[PDB]
Design a protein around this ligand. Structure first.
Ligand SMILES: *[C@@H]1O[C@H](CO)[C@@H](O[C@@H]2O[C@H](CO)[C@@H](O)[C@H](O)[C@H]2NC(C)=O)[C@H](O)[C@H]1NC(C)=O
Ligand SMILES: *[C@@H]1O[C@H](CO)[C@@H](O[C@@H]2O[C@H](CO)[C@@H](O)[C@H](O)[C@H]2NC(C)=O)[C@H](O)[C@H]1NC(C)=O
Ligand code: CU
Ligand code: CU
Ligand code: CU
Ligand code: CU
Length: 533
């Protein structure tokens, strides 16, 4: 299909790397004496010159950038992140991949208005993995994320550094955040407002930049792919520009929830919205060559229904030097980790159908706006349940996301006989792609925290109109652990608060060292994550 956005100078701008986000300070947790890292992020509009010869684009992002800055937090270190809304529409921050308490999880209605902020208390006790934080405000999640509110959150673990994977953020360990946008004739963004089917986009970006290039050395690199697009799913392959007909093999080492048990040799990677895979690619064998990262055509080989345009088959280019500066010491071990799978169950799976009810995208016929019916499941905390995710259509696909949990992919049947479970789906995941006429079964441990949580399709257009629902991970009233103040996402205790801009810029008032200290220490005393010990 003919490209609609104006022509871009392909592969002329180097791949940008989002800067590491540093904490402002640390507060000592009164309960155990340990340091909690405290950060401040300001949500605000900014201008970005995307087409060198046209006008600029109007974005809104964390700290005035897109992607937002990258967090790097070691397991065991609790963090508190104060997201300050200084924009012109409401926000709700969701750290995807983290078992946060309900009121810190970005519940769609748990909104912060302009002129307010909300403090998020993150546990960071889970396995090393690439998380990402992004907006979740009800009915406007698509435009908010699209205009720039998304960013990386790397949970790290020293035992994992002992594997000696390629390393160094921005050196040999490179984030690859894919988006897919559309631009107007004067180089501004085309809004998603009005789109009720899917917003495909015809200009592919990596890390905020359309069709970038990167100079690389002939050695191993670790790539952290994240499909951050509104609606576009990808089929990823590498190919020499001289032989685009031939796929260069590589290794997948991680999925949503962390490392696989063993590296999976792949030459084609399906990745859908909200999905994260880490890949090690070996440029050794291609010294002097240019490698193109490409995108499978025909709506991802017939798995999807995405529209393909003139240039959406291309992602970026890697120009490989003749030699390395220093010798590649890194390795990709055959054994990565023991994957902590849920204790298996064979209780009949709970069925969910993702489809259409009139003009609305629904889950078992309900829309999220329907407060009285959106709570589709009660699961006692500590329970393992299989869920059967069903897409009976050929006209839509749905990457399904379940909050709180990590899950194992049990099976996939395609009505088009297209595929089953992939080798890179061998580990633990929190989003799984239901392609054309696929039903997938997943197995998750609903643990270890009680609360009301979302689950939905991560096609943001579908999500907003209105393919989202809720589940309750329940406990008995004698459970304790302050469950009473942590189960309801709208719990007033944790709601947003107004601030004055002078206070924020002067780092005084609610933003003074002492006030931040007292507030965090008080949150801490509630001991929200103690059940994870
Ligand atoms: C989700 O489950 C929680 C925990 O089981 C429910 O909270 C209980 O609700 C009853 C009736 O209001 C109270 O007597 C209990 O004290 C509550 N328990 C706790 C731990 O607070 C909660 O109502 C459910 N949420 C929704 C929206 O249904
Ligand atoms: C549940 O929350 C309350 C309030 O955060 C905790 O009680 C506070 O504990 C601190 C220090 O441990 C005391 O100085 C306060 O006086 C307590 N406040 C109240 C209202 O009791 C309590 O320990 C938490 N309990 C659990 C089981 O996590
Ligand atoms: Cu998400
Ligand atoms: Cu999530
Ligand atoms: Cu969908
Ligand atoms: Cu969500």
């Amino acid at each position: 299909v003919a490209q609609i956005s104006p022509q871009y100078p392909m592969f002329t701008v180097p791949l940008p790397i989002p800067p590491v986000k540093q904490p402002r300070l640390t507060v000592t947790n009164p309960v155990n004496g340990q340091e909690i890292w405290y950060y401040e992020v300001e949500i605000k509009p900014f201008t970005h010159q995307v087409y060198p010869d046209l006008g600029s684009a109007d974005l809104v992002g964390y700290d005035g950038m897109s992607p937002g800055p990258t967090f790097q937090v070691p397991r065991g270190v609790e963090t508190v992140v104060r997201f300050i809304n200084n924009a012109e529409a409401p926000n709700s921050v969701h750290l995807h991949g983290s078992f946060s308490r309900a009121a810190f999880d970005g519940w769609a209605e748990d909104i912060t208005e302009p002129g307010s902020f909300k403090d998020y208390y993150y546990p960071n006790r889970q396995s090393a993995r690439t998380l990402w934080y992004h907006d979740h405000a009800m009915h406007i999640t698509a435009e908010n994320a699209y205009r720039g509110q998304a960013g990386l959150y790397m949970l790290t673990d020293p035992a994992e550094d002992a594997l000696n994977l390629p390393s160094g953020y921005g050196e040999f360990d490179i984030p690859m955040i894919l988006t897919s946008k559309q631009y107007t004739a004067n180089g501004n963004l085309v809004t998603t407002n009005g789109e009720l089917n899917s917003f495909w986009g015809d200009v592919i970006h990596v890390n905020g930049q359309p069709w970038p290039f990167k100079n690389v050395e002939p050695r191993k690199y670790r790539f952290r792919f994240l499909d951050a697009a509104v609606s576009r799913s990808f089929g990823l392959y590498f190919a020499d520009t001289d032989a685009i007909d031939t796929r260069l093999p590589f290794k997948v080492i991680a999925s949503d929830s962390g490392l696989l048990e063993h590296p999976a040799d792949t030459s084609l990677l399906y990745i859908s919205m909200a999905e994260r895979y880490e890949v090690v690619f070996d440029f050794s064998d291609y010294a002097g060559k240019t490698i193109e990262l490409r995108n499978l055509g025909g709506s991802i080989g017939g798995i999807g229904t995405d529209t393909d345009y003139d240039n959406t088959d291309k992602v970026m280019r890697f120009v490989v030097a003749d030699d390395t500066t220093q010798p590649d010491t890194s390795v990709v071990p055959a054994n990565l980790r023991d994957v902590p799978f849920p204790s298996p169950t064979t209780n009949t799976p709970r069925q969910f159908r993702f489809g259409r009810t009139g003009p609305t995208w629904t889950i078992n016929g309900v829309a999220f706006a329907d407060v009285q019916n959106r709570l589709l499941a009660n699961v006692p905390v500590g329970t393992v349940e299989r869920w059967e995710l069903i897409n009976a259509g050929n006209g839509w696909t749905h990457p399904i996301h379940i909050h709180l949990v990590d899950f194992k992919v049990i099976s996939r049947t395609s009505g088009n006989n297209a595929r089953t479970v992939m080798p890179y789906e061998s580990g633990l995941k929190d989003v799984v792609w239901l392609g054309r006429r696929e039903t997938v079964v997943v197995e998750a441990h609903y643990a270890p925290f009680p609360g009301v949580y979302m689950f939905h399709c991560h096609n943001l257009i579908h999500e907003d109109h209105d393919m989202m629902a809720a589940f309750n991970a329940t406990v008995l009233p004698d459970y304790g652990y302050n469950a009473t103040v942590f189960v309801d996402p709208m719990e007033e205790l944790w709601q947003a608060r107004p601030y004055e801009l002078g206070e924020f810029q002067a780092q005084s008032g609610q933003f003074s060292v002492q006030a931040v200290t007292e507030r965090i220490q008080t949150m801490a005393e509630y001991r929200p994550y103690a059940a994870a010990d």
